[PDB]
Design a protein around this ligand. Structure first.
Ligand SMILES: [K+]
Ligand SMILES: [K+]
Lengths: 534, 534, 83, 39
């Protein structure tokens, strides 16, 4: 009656049965020794730089226990609820007998928040030198109070590397930090065992690793603030953006999403109003449209007319040699720090074809505007002529971010006081010895053929993936990616949980821009990154 | 010195070591005494109903050898490249004991494609009765010409059940019809080894397996002709497009790219020329701006002025009741079949507000334009009021696709007489019982606030990936993606090497659009695609 | 029964952790004798040996890493191959 | 110091081994002579 999980009467492949003589010939092709190959070799995990500046009592490496330290296990942990056992983490220092500088290695028990202090060495520490020949192992054990862990547990053993004698090398410089890198590799260990099989469905599928946060080329790259391509990297000890600045918690202070689509709004007038309070038709925050930008006007101004710029404060000029041939530029215009959206400008029963628009945030007072930066449903602003005579219009509209007006300016996203934030502005400063950056992105200007330089905190493709995918990182680490200009030089970039990019060099300069990108691993936040220039 | 994949001087856990006395306790809690459980317990794969209406010679079950017959193996194949050996396929059945009917089973060799006819029984076959009690096994051998297989090998051994002698319910009338079922399970066997471990994140040389052409959710979907979101599918016997239709050879006959950016051009108008001929500035083909649309004017016309509609001689609509209540919307307008193009329109001296544009592919004739459904460097056409005064302007420009003006027309793309190829119009009719489909997109309009429909051959992301990522698809085959609405109504889409989608039913109807898309596998275009509707 | 020169490279300073210095699928082309004989056959089977020599007699720090990728893959210019 | 014409450190096939059960398989399908067939 009963039949078990294997029972069932056999008849076999009727025309022929499986011949082991065959399957051996497959093993005769390969060098197939045994399954579970991952229990018999090592795997790359990350690689940590160690410059001159890393004074002792300062950590390089820090990883808890678990299967995620070896992706072959990470692929199998989806099939088993639980695990148990040890893990071996190899180490190997670059600089082949050239350098000095011991380096510690500690296993800590579970339930701690380690500290960059020498008191961590008031504890059994193993040391090894930068003149190491054979790489080093450090079998981590599994110390625990329960019989078997789960995949969600964190209160586990954890390894740390910390500095014990600062290095020595006369072959480096203050700017670049080519040299020491501390490769780390892993292996499951003998006693390692998964436990408690599960059927797929469930296959929870969390543990997403940073590997697609940037493409592997430039031509795909675009700033989150503006649609045009990248051409340069810019440093600034501070950094700030809110429109699309996403973090690994998959959230922001940003009213917008990471899609350069147009902006639909239903403006309304009474008699002859050019300007009005644009209103949402699509949104994620109530009142504010999606894709709506962030830069206030500089000043109070009454938008009422056409372009006008004057050199010398004594002239008016409409040509290139007069533009460059200029003491200064003045911009005697009434819609100065504004934008250039497209404005399909529809309505019921309204000929006199669409015209161009001009938009910012600002507080409107009965014929004019003034800069406010705390955007609400009232602060929206437009200056398109929808042909309104003596009657409400009900002008539906669509708008796509397309340019600027504020000639005389020379950058955007540099005056934080003019940046539109809802209530809070995300922001950082230098860390470790690393500093923030922006991504430069040229932009249109309107009446004049020239362009102007934007600052951007995030590639869009970076900000898109964070909107969706639950990537993993601690609070005090990066998701390092590499950069290689086409002169052969290179530098690294880090990405904090917040999303602000970070870098380790002091300067960049010009470079062969047709460049690439790749993923090295994870790196503790509070360390100078690596680099090599020219 | 010269270190191997495992070489490394050990030091051990410094405070502890892996205490194998411990890990047994985990094995004591659970039944974990053995790895690779899937080699010793069966697994559901599918189930079948068998009823009196299903006559003799019918084929119920038909599955080929492979790893996919046990999803554990489907999960582990991602690590590896190859596979060899057999599979077991349990059959279990419970009939009343009063029933009869005998049911066959045949392993067939490779290279064949079975047929629902008794000539398949002119071949060694094993029978069993619906009175059968103990389940049955039918080990499927691997009968191959090579030492092993890859994962992209369909030319394998396979199995079939077929109704040798029909089912009998003596008590039943011939009108009413009952039927038992058949449950199938599998198990990897004994000689079933994978081979040739893959280093991630490799890129298999022939190409990867297409499982990211369609994003799962809907909100990520937009068409390859206009940026607006999908809302519904559209069947046609014939399909055709060139603008962004990228095949699995990562090429096309188009000119554009999978980015909906603006379109910089220049234009050299003299006297009062509202129109001109815009020239290329950024492209992939010389003399064609990237992202340029593909649709001609329907007929010759004179671009002169503002909108015009009618209600058949001549009561113009200026509201919704007339429009939605009208019979025909004949559109007496003089700039009919053009897009709307947000129109920055810069130059030296044009201190104006950058009036809005209209474009198409067509030959100018000294004041007007003639349709021509082939693009060159000349067909590019404009109408945007560059504010000219016989003071030759030479304006730079940049545009944006927003809507359309050919009111009353059918949805765009259903008229190859109009569509803008260069020399080749990519195209398919149907293949087998599976029919093509466009993807629908609502697009905007200029005067009347309503919106018209668009046809799209591909989602954008389906086209972006094929610009880049070389895949496998034998041209006789499909990439089968499965759709599920909010309710549960599903149907399978097929995708060809060329790129044109296909489906296996004559209609869809309405469905909760927050739908998703999942991967299934490869299937042969000679077979119909499934569908459960309503 | 001896070794034959094939080529030479420049592992200069401006190359980093993940570049490739050498990548050749298997075949006679790894030895300019055998290539002269592949014109006389349509087949081959068996291993080939290789030898390296770095010119840093005792000076140049820095090491390399080698992989034997299998047939079907097409390796990439990242670290992931070192898993 | 010196490295001779055939002097090196054999680590060998890292994942596998240049077997011998296999090469003779290629032989038996195609047949052989004493390292030459134009004689
Ligand atoms: K209008
Ligand atoms: K202008």
């Amino acid at each position: 009656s009963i039949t078990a999980p294997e029972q069932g009467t056999p008849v076999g492949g009727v025309i022929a049965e499986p011949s082991a003589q065959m399957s051996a010939a497959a093993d005769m092709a390969t060098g197939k020794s045994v399954d579970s190959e991952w229990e018999a070799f090592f795997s790359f995990h990350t690689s940590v730089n160690w410059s001159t500046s890393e004074t002792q009592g300062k950590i390089l490496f820090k990883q808890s226990l678990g299967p995620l330290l070896n992706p072959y296990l990470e692929h199998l942990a989806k099939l088993y609820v639980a695990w148990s056992g040890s893990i071996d983490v190899r180490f190997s220092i670059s600089g082949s007998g050239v350098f000095g500088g011991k380096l510690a290695a500690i296993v800590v028990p579970p339930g701690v928040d380690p500290v960059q202090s020498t008191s961590m060495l008031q504890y059994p520490h193993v040391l090894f030198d930068a003149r190491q020949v054979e790489p080093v192992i450090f079998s981590i054990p599994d110390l625990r109070s329960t019989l078997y862990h789960l995949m969600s547990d964190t209160d586990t053993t954890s390894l740390v590397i910390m500095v014990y004698n600062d290095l020595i090398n006369p072959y480096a410089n203050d700017s670049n930090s080519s040299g020491c890198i501390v490769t780390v590799e892993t292996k499951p260990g003998a006693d390692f065992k998964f436990h408690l099989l599960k059927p797929p469905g469930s296959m929870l599928t969390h543990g997403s690793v940073p590997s697609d946060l940037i493409p592997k080329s430039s031509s795909l790259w675009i700033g989150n603030r503006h649609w045009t391509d990248i051409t340069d990297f810019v440093i600034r000890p501070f950094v700030f953006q809110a429109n699309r600045h996403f973090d690994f918690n998959q959230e922001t202070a940003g009213w917008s999403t990471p899609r350069y689509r147009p902006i639909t709004i239903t403006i309304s007038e009474k008699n002859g109003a050019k300007l009005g309070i644009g209103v949402a038709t699509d949104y994620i925050v109530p009142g504010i449209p999606d894709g709506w930008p962030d830069t206030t006007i500089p000043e109070k101004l009454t938008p009422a007319g056409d372009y006008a710029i004057t050199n010398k404060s004594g002239n008016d000029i409409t040509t290139a040699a007069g533009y460059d041939g200029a003491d200064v530029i003045v911009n005697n215009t009434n819609f100065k720090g504004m934008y250039i959206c497209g404005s399909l400008q529809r309505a019921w029963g309204d000929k006199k074809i669409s015209n161009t628009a001009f938009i910012t945030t600002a507080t409107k007072v009965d014929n004019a505007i003034e800069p406010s930066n705390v955007i609400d449903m009232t602060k929206i602003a437009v200056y398109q002529d929808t042909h309104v005579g003596k009657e409400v219009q009900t002008s539906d509209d669509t708008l796509s971010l397309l340019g600027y007006t504020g000639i005389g300016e020379q950058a955007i996203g540099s005056d934080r006081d003019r940046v539109v934030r809802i209530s809070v502005l995300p922001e950082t400063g230098a860390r470790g010895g690393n500093h923030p950056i922006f991504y430069k992105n040229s932009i249109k200007l309107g009446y004049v053929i020239r362009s102007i330089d934007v600052f951007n905190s995030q590639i869009l493709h970076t900000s898109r993936q964070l909107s969706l995918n639950h990537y993993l990182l601690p609070p005090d680490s990066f998701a390092v990616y590499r950069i290689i200009d086409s002169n052969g030089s290179w530098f690294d970039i880090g990405i904090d949980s917040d999303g602000f990019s970070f870098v380790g060099v002091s300067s960049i300069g010009k470079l062969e821009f047709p460049l690439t990108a790749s993923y090295m691993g994870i790196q503790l936040a509070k360390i100078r990154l690596a680099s090599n220039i020219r």
